[PDB]
């Protein structure tokens, strides 16, 4: 519902962890960031082992709770939270000025951050957040 982001990042074909690491760095520097097209973000490796790891996080839990996200939306945001001291004041502030979106709700196009791009012509072993979500059982709403 309207988010004045000083920066709009395009995660399409970009390595999730590398984008996350930079969006965290910027958020702590006071930048308001909006990550777009999360469903198209990418994570390298063997799809079978990658999914096994995210499936384990989904199965973990108990009464106290280990609510782990399934949508690429939340997967990505949780990824960023893990790079922020979200329990400290400055950390929660940073984290709260960062939002992730399925598709691109803005008119502008996001920018591709240097060092985070993946070349599909040079890589066959990688997966898509969207693919991971579908496997996890998420309702492909994107």
């Amino acid at each position: 519902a309207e988010f004045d982001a000083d920066v709009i990042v395009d995660a399409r074909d970009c390595i999730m962890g590398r984008v996350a690491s930079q969006v965290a760095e910027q958020a702590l520097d006071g930048e308001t960031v909006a990550v777009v097209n999360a469903e198209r973000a990418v994570i390298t490796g063997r799809e079978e082992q990658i999914v096994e790891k995210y499936e384990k996080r989904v199965d973990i839990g108990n009464d106290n709770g280990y609510f782990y996200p399934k949508r690429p939306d939340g997967i990505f945001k949780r990824t960023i939270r893990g790079m922020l001291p979200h329990k400290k004041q400055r950390g929660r502030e940073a984290f709260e000025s960062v939002r992730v979106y399925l598709g691109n709700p803005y008119d502008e196009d996001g920018e591709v951050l240097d060092g985070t791009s993946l070349d599909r012509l040079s890589n066959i072993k990688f997966v898509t957040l969207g693919e991971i979500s579908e496997t996890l059982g998420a309702n492909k709403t994107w």
Partner: protein, 337 residues
């Protein structure tokens, strides 16, 4: 060697707390196949009686023979689809877009809502049709309510409101089908949706029993033999092992039992009539007399008499339909005795 044994009670109906809406809310609807049509209806539980039926089952060794069958009488007077709500598809699922209301309202619908005095049915319709052209339209449902007044045995006059999805042919066709119903007055009946012999899923808030112990609530054993005389009769053995050092939510404990929403599947509709054929002599206990639109559901239905029950076309039927079963007898014998 400690024999195995399934746990006590199901973990699929929790938490076992008091229901938020006494009016049931379906969490699923039939699939779109036939022509457009309202996918549900409602009524008020009255009581039970039995009926002798001619075995309909083509695979039964008794096909064509007399058969006594238990029936729960539900008074199903006409309802009123008072509005058409449209849902749009978004990155976060379905969300209400707008609603198309009417002008004719039952005299007492104002006991629950603030009835519209100024509304634009065309601006609404317009926005909806534009949503379809755009391809962002989600399912289509009708805001519906009952007419308690039509039922003398039920004291409430305040109508019960529920939303019921409209499925059917193509969206354009059922959207138009929806708008038609609403406009009139929305007055529709049980006949319009169901046919005697079809299978319906019935939803309702069970009978409340307040607080009850593990024995009754979860079906755990009572203490046995010598273990029943030392000071513990209806208490479980232990709340868990030494480790983990906490009580898991899975151990059977005391608490609210009853007054929970339940959706009973594949209830066969034995007969849909009107009048007093099903009524019982002396009147249904704690209810009254029936003489109006009614439905005879095979077997039991969740809830106490007078509670609002909802019907929906069975979403997972096991058997094919065998329309209009032949009823040779309907007991009217007093229920007191």
């Amino acid at each position: 060697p400690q024999p195995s044994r399934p746990r006590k009670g199901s973990l699929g109906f929790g938490p076992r707390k008091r229901s938020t809406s006494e009016t049931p809310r379906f969490n699923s609807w039939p699939s779109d196949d036939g022509q457009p049509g309202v996918q549900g209806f409602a009524g008020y539980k009255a009581g039970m009686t039995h009926v002798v039926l001619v075995n309909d089952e083509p695979n039964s060794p008794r096909e064509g023979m007399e058969e006594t069958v238990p029936v729960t009488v539900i008074e199903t007077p006409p309802m009123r689809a008072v509005a058409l709500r449209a849902y749009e598809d978004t990155p976060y699922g379905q969300r209400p877009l707008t609603e198309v209301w009417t002008d004719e309202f039952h005299s007492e619908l104002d006991r629950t809502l603030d009835v519209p005095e100024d509304h634009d049915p065309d601006a609404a319709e317009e926005q909806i049709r534009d949503a379809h052209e755009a391809g962002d339209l989600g399912d289509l449902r009708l805001i519906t309510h009952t007419v308690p007044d039509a039922v003398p045995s039920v004291p409430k006059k305040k109508p019960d409101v529920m939303e019921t999805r409209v499925g059917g042919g193509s969206v354009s066709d059922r959207l138009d089908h929806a708008l038609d119903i609403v406009e009139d007055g929305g007055e529709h009946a049980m006949n319009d949706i169901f046919r005697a012999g079809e299978y319906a899923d019935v939803a309702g808030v069970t009978k409340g029993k307040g607080t009850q112990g593990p024995v009754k609530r979860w079906g755990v054993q009572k203490r046995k033999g010598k273990h029943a005389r030392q000071g513990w009769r209806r208490r479980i053995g232990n709340l868990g092992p030494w480790n983990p050092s906490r009580v898991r939510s899975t151990v059977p404990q005391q608490g609210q039992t009853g007054y929970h929403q339940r959706t009973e599947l594949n209830k066969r509709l034995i007969d849909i009539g009107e009048g007093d054929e099903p009524t019982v002599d002396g009147g249904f206990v704690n209810y009254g007399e029936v003489d109006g639109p009614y439905t005879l559901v095979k077997g039991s239905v969740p809830g106490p008499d007078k509670r609002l029950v909802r019907f929906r076309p069975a979403v997972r039927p096991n058997d094919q339909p065998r329309l209009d079963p032949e009823v040779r007898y309907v007991s009217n014998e007093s229920n007191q005795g």
